Each structure stands twice: as structure tokens, then as C-alpha cells.
Amino acid sequence: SKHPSGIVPTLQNIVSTVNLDCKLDLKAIALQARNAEYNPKRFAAVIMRIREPKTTALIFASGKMVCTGAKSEDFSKMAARKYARIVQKLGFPAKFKDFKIQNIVGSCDVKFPIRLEGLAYSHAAFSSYEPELFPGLIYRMKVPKIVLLIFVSGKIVITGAKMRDETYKAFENIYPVLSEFRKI
DNA sequence: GCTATAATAGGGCA
DNA sequence: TGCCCTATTATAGC
């Protein structure tokens, strides 16, 4: 009823941001922390990681923080919360302001090969397929505004969503098309 | 471990 | 001002 295709895209990566609302001393965090990495000349953030939920945090001097790698939105907020407390314990008056899911990446397998060239040709205003550069067809759906990477194998990557239902809807919108161009 | 995709954050530079 | 800096993640042919 929500997934007429019978297939449910698996969530693979969630990118979120949160505002710790306090400037941070990155050199102090990098020295005091254990799971930290800081190379100012390369990137302006402290890169930290935890095991559960398995994620990576990018902590900036401004107090802003990016959390990547989680398998769900809840897992992403949970992870972000642990990093916030890690930073709190380090001495800073960190809070958890304006948490937001910025991107959801999902993937699935329709279990049948696809004729990418024919698909791109019939949907040129939406498709970008150049095998010699990247083996996947880049499908830029407008409603919802989502990008799908369609491979000959039947495997699909769906990215750009800020709510999981967009991920699901884009896949459901694309399913009938993939079937039309099933490789025989 | 590069190719390409989305999204975020910051310093640095043409 | 734009854009790459970095890390994430599925995918696949090089």
C-alpha cells in the first residue's frame, strides 16, 4: 500500500547537522579527545568517530557539526547526541540546537537487468548516461527532487532526500520505468 | 582508488 | 563569488 513495488529501498547513509551553540577550540579537542583527527591545513574540522551507531562527525570551531554514516534518521540523531556529550565532557557548553537531516541515501535491487541506453533515450530531459565516464545512468527526478543512479545490474542508488518518503516515492515512480526497459 | 551522486559544514584562493 | 578543501554511502567499470 506504501510500497506497491513490493521492494523497500534500504537506507545506507544519513547526513545531518546540529548546532552546538558555542565556539569550540579545535586544537584543545584534538589533543584531549582520543577518537579525533585534526589537520587545519587540509580541512577546517575535527574528524571524530564512534562505534555505535557507526558514524563520523565533522566538528567545526563555529560549533556546527556534521554527522554522516548512520543507517537511519534516529541513529543519526543518537550519534550526533553522543558526539555532543563527548564535546560537553571535554569542557565546552555544547547544546543540541537545530538538528536536521540533510541527506538520505538509499539503495535497492529490482532483481532484473536494465537497458540503460533505451531508458536514457526515452527520458532525455531527466537522464544523463555516459558509460565511458560512469557506468550508471544519472536520473534527476523533479518530483520528488531526487537523483537516482540506475545500473545495468538492476541495482539502484537513490540520493538527495531529506525525508525517507521521498526516497520511497522516487523509487516507486521509477519502478514502472525500469520494468519497461528490462533487458531481455 | 577514480570515475559520478546528493547533502552538510569551513578555510583558502582565483 | 564560486568552488574545492573533507567524510559518508550505496552502485560498477576501469
| Residue with CA nearest C1' of nucleotide B11 | A44
Q: Are A5-15+102-183 and A16-101 equal in CATH topology? A: yes
Q: DSSP per residue over A82-102, as a string?
A: HHHHHHHHTT-----EEEEEE
Where do the domains of chain A lie? 5-15+102-183, 16-101
Q: In Å, what resolution does this model reach?
A: 2.1
Cell of A149: 543512479
Q: What is the DSSP letter of A151?
A: -
| CATH superfamily membership of A16-101 | TATA-Binding Protein (3.30.310.10)
- CA A176/CA A173 separation, integer angstroms: 7
Q: What is the DSSP letter of A3?
A: -
Q: Is the CB of A44 under 7 A from strand C?
A: yes
Buried b (16+ CB within 10 A) or exposed e, A87-121: beebebebebeebebeebbbbbebeebbbbeebbe
Scanning every strand, the nucleotide with its C1' closest to A146's CA turns out to be B6
Rounded to 5°, the CA angle A76-A172-A128 comes to 90
Q: How far is the CA of A94 from the C1' of C12 (A)?
A: 42
Q: DSSP per residue over A25-64, as a string?
A: -HHHHHHH-SSEEE-TTT-SSEEEEETTTTEEEEE-TTSE
Hits for CB < 7 Å against strand B across A residues 1-60: 13, 15, 17, 40, 43-45, 58, 60
Write out the CATH class of domain A5-15+102-183.
alpha beta
Do A183 and A30 touch, CB atoms closer than 8 A? no
